[PDB]
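Hi,

I'm pasting everything inline rather than attaching a file, because the server keeps stripping attachments. The sequence lines come first, and each chain or strand is labelled.
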Amino acid sequence: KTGLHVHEKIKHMVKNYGTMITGIPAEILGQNEAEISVGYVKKMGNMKENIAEVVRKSEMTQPTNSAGKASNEVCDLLLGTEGASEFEKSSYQVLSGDGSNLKGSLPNKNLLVRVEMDRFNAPQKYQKIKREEFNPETAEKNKIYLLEDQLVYLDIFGKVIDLGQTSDTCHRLFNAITTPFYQNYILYDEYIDPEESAEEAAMFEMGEIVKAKMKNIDCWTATHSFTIFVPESDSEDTRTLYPYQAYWTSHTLQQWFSGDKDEKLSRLGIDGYIEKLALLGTTTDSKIRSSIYGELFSPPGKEHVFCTGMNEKFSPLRVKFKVTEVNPEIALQNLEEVQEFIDTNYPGENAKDQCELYKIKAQEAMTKQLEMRLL
Amino acid sequence: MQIFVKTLTGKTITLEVEPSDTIENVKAKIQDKEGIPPDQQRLIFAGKQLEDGRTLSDYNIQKESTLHLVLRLRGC
Amino acid sequence: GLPRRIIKETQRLLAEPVPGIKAEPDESNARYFHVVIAGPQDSPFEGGTFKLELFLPEEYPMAAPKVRFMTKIYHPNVDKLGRICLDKWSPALQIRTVLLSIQALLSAPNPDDPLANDVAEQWKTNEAQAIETARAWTRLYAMNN
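And the predicted assembly:
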């Protein structure tokens, strides 16, 4: 019972069963999808056919594509419900510039790494506003507001963050920015020449104040999550890792596994994968940041188009990790228990037939509840 | 006040919030309890999608209301 | 009456045009752009020329430009009206940013998991049949216009 066998089993079962790996009864998925979708039912003509119109276009049996939910399922299977709950009580560590702290936390044992990556979401817009008209509860968040006596940052939680400017300073800036198009505009315009006008000088000065204050304000928001499984190896040079992920805008863990991207990245070596992951958080070249982000986290085949154009990674990123040991027997029994649940409640000769029965039983439960509230 | 967030798999969690709290504030509290990046969550209240720049008061979400956490993006 | 940012972006857009793409302003309203993108190499759209229409709202660059396809294209991200599937707009982006992403969608037309239209459903199941449809429509509507 190796750690490698654990990798092959969870890869095999996710590929074959998709969302059924969570062990949720299909009736519950259909009932919960029903109460969610009861508003989208067209109440004009034939209601019995209008309910089936919503059931046919359902996606309750397609797997989650949230990266965090995928990581939650990996931990649940490899560590167990109780072991996963203890793992999330652990605290993340910021990955070092070279990744040494992570390279030095894999002592040739069956290990599970969980990763959370943040993007720095600093403000890029500003607006002049009078204090009497400034309502933080309704105003646009993640924005600079230049009042006649104060310069503030309205963070994503609707809190007023003071940027340390005096009334005399803000009064000068407030009164120098007079062009109507510049009352509600952007920070860091490339065409603002501070030597051509007193307005552009004030706008450039405000941008410099905001950049200096924002370096010390927590604009970090979690943007991606995944896990890395590093099984035990015979030799010190035979050890490899396996990254597992879904991605919100792109793919599921089933598609990840189906494309063998876990094994393709495994061939980079442990030091090779960590080197790119560490470079992702240290580089200041947004082009290098984009291609590394695409190489590591894109669905298989989209590495070159994942982070181009509008998806270019212009913001700083930081990579955080946490590590814990895996018991293969616990993981293989957790996987076998899911197989028992699948074989008992949704029987079939092959995996494909069991998934279709699961979907049918989820669809009829959705129809039953939708009809029990609309017929 | 308490609000409830329910998922497709039946799980329900209780969040401690103010009516003036932003949707990004609610997603961060979900990150604290479930470890899900706010960039990879979607919140629904009474069939309507909650946008990130808004607050719970913009949708008349009150005490002990139930939100829906959607963990599969479906668009276009 | 145009904002200064739009005027100078247009000049940089023509002095340094994005490769494989040609875009011009309209004679009357300078906020409307006529775009032509070449079909990327080794793609089902190779050899084709695709015309688009781009518009800059009054809130630009705080708001994204508005795009629409002119020539008929078989793509899981473009609908029957020419609307393209793409809340991730920052003022740092510009017109060439939007164009490079549309060009990238032709270079990799395989649909994303969230996409749930039926042009995306056909590309997912019978991808071989959908790629030849994209090759067919490229020869019909994008090789003589």
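Chain A touches chain C through 30 residues (CB under 8 Å).

If the labels don't parse on your end, tell me and I'll reformat.
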